[PDB]
Design a protein around this ligand. Structure first.
Ligand SMILES: C[C@H]1CCC[C@H](C[C@H]2Cc3cc(O)cc(O)c3C(=O)O2)O1
Ligand SMILES: N[C@@H](CCCC[NH3+])C(=O)O
Length: 487
């Protein structure tokens, strides 16, 4: 702040002396990574006759009599030494280096490539220019930034913390690997709308906004599911969308109101076929983007995601954990007595057979899972868009995938019968009459699309930020460049 005034004074002084502190048209001949790669076998204390013009952020500096040193860091983190010698740039230019250049400044250095006496790959400057005067100093070390500071100023965090650049790179690589795995399998990527006149496809409160052009309220999508199914009616055979959804709910280490998700749809497959593809995709993504299926976690542990994953049924695994047979016919009263006997808090929101079964399963089974696990065959009350089971009464052909304790993905045999789907919406209407404001509202145009005939298909959904959390052990806020902060 005292430091801010000083740097601002320098900026103005340069502009008034004719030395442009934010010049345009600087040509950079090599990145620093290019210099380090080309000259990796340069002998110590030797010089070349190759002239280069590099640019980079000054992150370290040393001053002596006729010779100043500075460590430049390119945007990717690669570092190279710049040497400002009296006998090379001249009295007038060297003095300007000492008085004008500060830590954090972006500078351009033109000179010849050498290796210093200490074996440091360097550019021996014959000239230099300010490229971008910095008015604020960098933190002395990334340890000095709180976690909230990293989120509020990711642009500083990327400069000073190598792990921040590495997570950003992993995110980009994971998403590219996801698309590669789906392209190998013949899936096509489409765009469906983000502003919707009715937001369905999941159970969540929407963000609401007023349209000036249409003169009505619109909703940000909570899922692309109902529009991807219209694509299936229209003839897309294998289709996906990897992009943002928006849910107007709470924030914690596994939930962000704005997040990235993948949804896939495949005709003439069931939830058994999408469980197989989802496992292989995750494992291929690990290979391509992380380099291993034995995942290093931040606490030093190794998490094995290789091989085939366990599968279990919700009702039967719950029954085993409790020592009592739970079925679709178990009463709401019985389920509440079981919960209270296990000291399970049941929010005044959670009611109905289906929600009570899921709650008990999460407490007695789900929270105790370590290895990657599919749980399948869900209560029909909580799965309005899922086809009923081909042979077992009262359940639907859905699975959830848990990896490292995180709910990562889900897959359905899709409900394509338009009459039954209309019945499912009526059951949601009764739930919403009982006070559930997450219940789905009936979408008449979606039903109209089903009434033209949707081929049988299987769909999946996967949280992309959650995928990265599972691969790295990070929380959802560490995997996004710019998570939302209250101003
Ligand atoms: C697209 C779906 C399919 C099932 C797994 C996963 C659940 C999903 C829930 C969810 C809800 C929410 O309000 C905020 C969030 O960040 C997430 C999330 O990351 O993941 O993503
Ligand atoms: N729409 C689902 C993901 C796809 C479900 C399978 N059709 C969700 O948001 O949870």
């Amino acid at each position: 702040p005292e430091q801010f005034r000083i740097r601002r004074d320098k900026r103005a002084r340069l502009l008034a002396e004719g030395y442009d502190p934010y010049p345009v048209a600087i040509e950079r001949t090599h990145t620093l990574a290019e210099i380090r790669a080309t000259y990796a076998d340069l002998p110590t204390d030797s010089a070349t006759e190759d002239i280069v013009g590099v640019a980079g952020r000054v992150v370290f500096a040393r001053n002596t009599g006729k010779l100043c040193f500075a460590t430049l860091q390119d945007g990717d983190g690669t570092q190279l030494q710049a040497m400002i010698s009296l006998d090379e740039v001249g009295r007038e230019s060297l003095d300007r280096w000492k008085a004008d250049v500060d830590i954090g400044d972006v500078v351009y250095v033109h000179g010849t490539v050498i290796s210093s006496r200490r074996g440091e790959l360097s550019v021996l400057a014959d000239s230099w220019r300010m490229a971008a005067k910095a008015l604020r100093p960098l933190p002395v070390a990334h340890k000095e930034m709180s976690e909230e500071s990293r989120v509020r100023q990711r642009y500083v965090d990327l400069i000073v913390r190598p792990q921040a650049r590495e997570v950003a790179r992993q995110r980009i690589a994971v998403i590219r690997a996801v698309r590669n795995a789906l392209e190998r399998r013949g899936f096509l990527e489409v765009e469906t709308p983000m502003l919707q006149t009715l937001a369905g496809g999941a159970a969540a409160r929407p963000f609401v906004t007023h349209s000036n052009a249409l003169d009505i309220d619109l909703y940000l999508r909570i899922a692309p599911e109902l529009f991807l199914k219209r694509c299936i009616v229209g003839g897309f055979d294998r289709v996906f969308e990897l992009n943002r959804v928006f849910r107007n709910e709470g924030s914690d280490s596994t939930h962000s109101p704005e997040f990235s998700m993948l949804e896939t749809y495949q005709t003439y497959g069931t939830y058994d076929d999408s469980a197989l593809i989802t496992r292989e995709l995750i494992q291929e993504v690990a290979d391509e983007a992380i380099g291993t299926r034995q995942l290093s976690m931040p606490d030093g542990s190794v998490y094995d995601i290789d091989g085939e994953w366990a599968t279990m049924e919700m009702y039967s695994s719950l029954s085993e954990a409790l020592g009592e047979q739970i079925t679709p016919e178990t009463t709401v009263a019985r389920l509440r007595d079981i919960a209270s006997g296990l000291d399970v808090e049941i929010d005044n929101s959670v009611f109905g057979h289906g929600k009570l079964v899921e709650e008990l399963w999460e407490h007695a089974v789900g929270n105790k899972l370590t290895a990657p696990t599919f749980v399948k065959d869900f209560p029909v009350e909580t799965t309005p868009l899922t086809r009923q089971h081909r042979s077992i009464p009262g359940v639907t052909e859905k699975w959830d995938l848990y990896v490292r304790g995180v709910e990562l993905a889900t897959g359905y045999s899709e409900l394509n019968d338009p009459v039954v789907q209309r019945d499912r919406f009526a059951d949601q209407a009764r739930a919403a009459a009982a006070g559930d404001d997450e219940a789905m509202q009936l979408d008449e145009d979606f039903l109209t699309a089903l009434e033209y005939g949707m081929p049988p298909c299987t769909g999946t959904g996967m949280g992309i930020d959650r995928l990265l959390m599972c691969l790295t052990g990070l929380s959802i806020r560490e995997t996004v460049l710019f998570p939302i902060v209250r101003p």
